[PDB]
Amino acid sequence: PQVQFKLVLVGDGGTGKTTFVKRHLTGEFEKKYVATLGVEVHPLVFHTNRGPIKFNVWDTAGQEKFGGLRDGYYIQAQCAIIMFDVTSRVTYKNVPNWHRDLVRVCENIPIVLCGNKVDIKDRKVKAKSIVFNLQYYDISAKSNYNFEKPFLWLARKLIGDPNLEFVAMPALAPPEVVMDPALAAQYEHDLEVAQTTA
Amino acid sequence: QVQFKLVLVGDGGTGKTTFVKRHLTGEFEKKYVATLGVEVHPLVFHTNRGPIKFNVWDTAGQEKFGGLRDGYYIQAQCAIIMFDVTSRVTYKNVPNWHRDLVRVCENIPIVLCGNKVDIKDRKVKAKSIVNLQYYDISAKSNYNFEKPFLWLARKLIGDPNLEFVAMPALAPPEVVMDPALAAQYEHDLEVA
Amino acid sequence: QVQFKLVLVGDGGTGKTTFVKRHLTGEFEKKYVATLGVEVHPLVFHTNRGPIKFNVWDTAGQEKFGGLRDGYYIQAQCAIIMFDVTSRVTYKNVPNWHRDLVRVCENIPIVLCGNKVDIKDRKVKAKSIVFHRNLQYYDISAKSNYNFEKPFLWLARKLIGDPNLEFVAMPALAPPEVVMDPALAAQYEHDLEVAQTTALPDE
Amino acid sequence: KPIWEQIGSSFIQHYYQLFDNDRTQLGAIYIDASCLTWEGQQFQGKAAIVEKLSSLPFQKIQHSITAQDHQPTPDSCIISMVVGQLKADEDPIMGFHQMFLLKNINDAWVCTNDMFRLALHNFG
Amino acid sequence: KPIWEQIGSSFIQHYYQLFDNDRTQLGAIYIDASCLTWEGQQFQGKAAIVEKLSSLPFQKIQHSITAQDHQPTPDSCIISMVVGQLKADEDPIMGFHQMFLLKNINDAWVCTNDMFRLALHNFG
Ligand SMILES: Nc1nc2c(ncn2[C@@H]2O[C@H](COP(=O)(O)OP(=O)(O)O)[C@@H](O)[C@H]2O)c(=O)[nH]1
Ligand SMILES: Nc1nc2c(ncn2[C@@H]2O[C@H](COP(=O)(O)OP(=O)(O)O)[C@@H](O)[C@H]2O)c(=O)[nH]1
Ligand SMILES: Nc1nc2c(ncn2[C@@H]2O[C@H](COP(=O)(O)OP(=O)(O)O)[C@@H](O)[C@H]2O)c(=O)[nH]1
Ligand SMILES: [Mg+2]
Ligand SMILES: [Mg+2]
Ligand SMILES: [Mg+2]
């Protein structure tokens, strides 16, 4: 029928996975909870210059706070977002564990790494540490900062068009926090420098 | 709108699901709730007092393993207890179902239904059967389909003169109900 | 004397004759009875409570063409059922030997023996061997005299009613024609131990 | 792999293979002291248990294990707990939970205690 | 109601009361010989168990019991199985199971064995 892509969203509890996916208002409105699987599936539609794409984002019911995910949570995933908290160094050090599982259960699908809560001034995990088929982005879910970036990169990879663009932002929940334009510019530069080093 | 939660209970294989599925818009508009093990069939009836809706709870077959959960019974305003007229054991389990129901819901109206009366070799007859009403039904033939719902509606609304001004669209009969048997069955029960 | 008839049975080629022949004096003193198709070996074992004599009945190969006659089984006070651990068919016939044995001799003590455990590429392993459940099992290798005394000791303990009975000395045995790898032997004994301790009930 | 986990895993595989194949033969894993609680209903001993399981009114059933955990107890028993799914006849797939306690009696691990519940609840 | 049902129900009520309000105070029910398997991860001893349960990354949690079944064991223990639902923080409601083996020591019942799982599966 439609070109749908299963996107599994994973990462340590409290990293802001749920807050992040909920930003897309229609996807929240039209989500579906399946308790047997422990997942809320959000249909996130984005509109590219070459038409619409639909990400079916699997958000956990918080069972990562209890233990590991069932393998069937990952099954048939076509892309993924690994999420950590830039104010919590442990969430970042657990990223390889998440990556480890994804590669095991899943095919060589594209994966995006997202460091969340960059609006919080006291940042522990910075660009330098992060940069040393995978990409990284700073995001702040509470301020919609860089919200579209992970989806654009995955869309480009999945469709095989590196010149793919989004012609319009989906309806987003209004920012509950200000992303300081000065910090954002600085972080964006810190990433420019870290990229030049890579 | 006026809606009533109706729990449809009884032994496995008595024809509960076949009965409720008869109501076509109710089947089409049903909703499965996995955690509760129920399919809720929203059955609308047009009455001389306006539209009423019986939200009928049908099991996912878990009555085969044992009793139903409280959450299945909770806030039911009426109930249908069903059994198989060809299986006497399903009828001897009626009090257990009644008991399980009352334990959660003390004083709701109940209709008892002996299903499969189209099967000529019948084991449970009017002799043995006579806020609780009984009707013969045959789900496969649409026979007496409306009877339990009309009684419950009159009882619930408190209007003994409530009428269904229209019959819901029913799945076409898959079996014929013998007119002579029906008349006899109806005669037997009328008399008391 | 204190003697017992012992019937040694099982499929042909399982190594029954090789086994009984290990006891050199019993081979020397054997008596052949053509009419019953048997060679009877007087196997003397010397226990701490004195000597015991197992008169072992060995076939003349008739098991290759079908079961043994009642005249063979009759009056047996104990028995050994043998199979080949490299041949699955011989282990699948073990129940058939038990049945015939029980028909003519209902309640006698029986030992089950998996022969030729010296051969690598064993097919019938410990885990598979749960049949025995008056029954006892042992690995044996006739060609190497491995565990040769085990079945007779167990049978001697049951018959006399003394579970503490020991053999004070091994009889004169034919020198091993084959090596039983000690490491391989230790492993096999461990497998059987574990199989027993992790046993679920019988069907 | 610990010995208790070995015995437990074997028991679980055998119990569900047999249940799905033929309920009526499950008597062999119990004894007369055995306790069953089946969806709240209690049964004692080999016979009553076999009667109960055999009487379950479905023509066919299938089980699958999602997770099984095993432990030894101070009294040298084995606890075996299961969370899985099942399908009776053509009904929807349902989760289930089951607990077994194993004791080594007469050189075989018999089930002394058994508890079963469907994964159905009170809140939708 | 049998004695094992009265004791079992009291343990259950006390366990989840403590668990829902202050996990850190759950040591008292466990001993050094206690075994906990928590979503597959095994733990031994009162100290290690309390640490694990305290470290669980949620701020609030709430359990409701769907069903609890209690039996007496041949070695005079009480084995209990629980099926129910929980809610951590503001997350969705999930099903769960939990088993307890209670042993009477010095006229005081303590948990020697504990197993926990979320009622989650690989496929619907
Ligand atoms: N300041 C800030 N807090 C956030 C952000 N995203 C999530 N949080 C907070 O992190 C906590 C847990 O978020 P949640 O979405 O439940 O994380 P999850 O466990 O990965 O689903 C909540 O109290 C949120 O307010 C963000 O972008 N900025
Ligand atoms: N002859 C006859 N069979 C029926 C009738 N209603 C149901 N059945 C049959 O009874 C069997 C079980 O019916 P089902 O609806 O699944 O019973 P349930 O377990 O109570 O839901 C099916 O094979 C149906 O075909 C009826 O009115 N007449
Ligand atoms: N490798 C090995 N071969 C054996 C052993 N016992 C018997 N055999 C061989 O098996 C064949 C038949 O053995 P035999 O004693 O005649 O078996 P029987 O028919 O049961 O008496 C002979 O070729 C033997 O060499 C053993 O312990 N190890
Ligand atoms: Mg979440
Ligand atoms: Mg049904
Ligand atoms: Mg021979």
Indicate if ligand 3 lies below 6 Å from the C-beta of C119: yes
The amino acid occupying position A120 is I
What is the best residue among C8, C14, C18, C89 to mutate for testing ligand 3's pocket, by most ligand atoms within 8 Å of CB? C18
Please tell me the distance from the alpha carbon of residue B192 to that of residue E40, in angstroms, as a whole number.
65
Backbone angles phi, psi at A102, to 5 degrees: -55, -50
Please tell me the distance from the alpha carbon of residue B30 to that of residue E73, in angstroms, as a whole number.
45
C88-91 contacts, C-beta under 8 A, 24 or more apart: C88/C123, C88/C124, C89/C11, C90/C10, C90/C11, C90/C13, C90/C14, C91/C124, C91/C128, C91/C129
Please tell me the distance from the alpha carbon of residue E59 to that of residue C68, in angstroms, as a whole number.
78
Evaluate whether chains B and D are touching (3 or more beta carbon pairs less than 8 Å apart): yes
**Which 3-state string (H, E, C) describes B118-170?**
CCCCCCCCHHHHCCEEEEECEHHHCECCCHHHHHHHHHHHCCCCCCECCCCCE
Q: Does B69 touch chain E (CB under 8 A)?
A: yes
Query: Considering only CB atoms, which chain C residues are within 8 Å of D14?
Result: 200
A67 and E123: CB-CB below 8 Å? no
Domain boundaries, chain D: 1-124
Q: Terminal CA-to-CA distance of chain A, rounded, Å?
A: 41
Please tell me the distance from the alpha carbon of residue A47 to that of residue E20, in angstroms, as a whole number.
45
Q: Does A32 touch chain E (CB under 8 A)?
A: no
What is the best residue among A19, A39, A88, A147 to mutate for testing ligand 1's pocket, by most ligand atoms within 8 Å of CB? A19
A180-183 contacts, C-beta under 8 A, 24 or more apart: A180/A119, A180/A121, A183/A118, A183/A119, A183/A121
Give 3-state DSSP helix, strand, coil % of chain B, rounded to 5: 35, 30, 40
Alpha helices in chain D (DSSP H): 3-21, 46-55
Please tell me the distance from the alpha carbon of residue B185 to that of residue B137, in angstroms, as a whole number.
10
Cβ-based neighbour number of residue C107 at 10 Å: 7
Please, which experimental method was used?
X-ray
Q: Among A33, A63, A65, whose Cβ lies nearest the Cβ of E120?
A: A63
C196 and D11: CB-CB below 8 Å? no
Distance from CA of A73 to the nearest CA of B (A): 18
Chains that touch D (3 or more CB pairs under 8 A): B, C, E
Residue of A nearest to E52 (CA): A66
Cβ-based neighbour number of residue A88 at 10 Å: 17
Please tell me the distance from the alpha carbon of residue E81 to that of residue E102, in angstroms, as a whole number.
11
The amino acid occupying position E32 is D
Q: Among D3, D6, D108, whose Cβ lies nearest the Cβ of C201?
A: D108
Burial of B167 by CB count in 10 Å (0-12 exposed, 13-18 middle, 19+ buried)? exposed
B65 and D56: CB-CB below 8 Å? yes
Question: Can you name the residues that pair with B46 across neighbouring β-strands?
Answer: B51
Burial E93-116 (b: 16+ CB within 10 A, else e): bbbbbbbbbbbeeeeebbbbbbbb
In terms of DSSP bridges, do strands B38-47 and B50-59 run parallel, antiparallel, or are they unpaired?
Answer: antiparallel
In a mutational test of the A interface, the residue from E120, E121, E122, E123 whose CB has the highest number of chain A CBs within 10 Å is E120
| Nearest partner of D117 among E109, A163, B37, A76, judged by Cα | B37
Domains of chain A: 1-198 (3.40.50.300)
Q: What are the tokens at D101?
A: 């306690």
Please tell me the distance from the alpha carbon of residue B189 to that of residue D58, in angstroms, as a whole number.
33
CATH architecture of the domain with range E1-124: Roll (3.10)
Ligand nearest to the CA of B64: 2
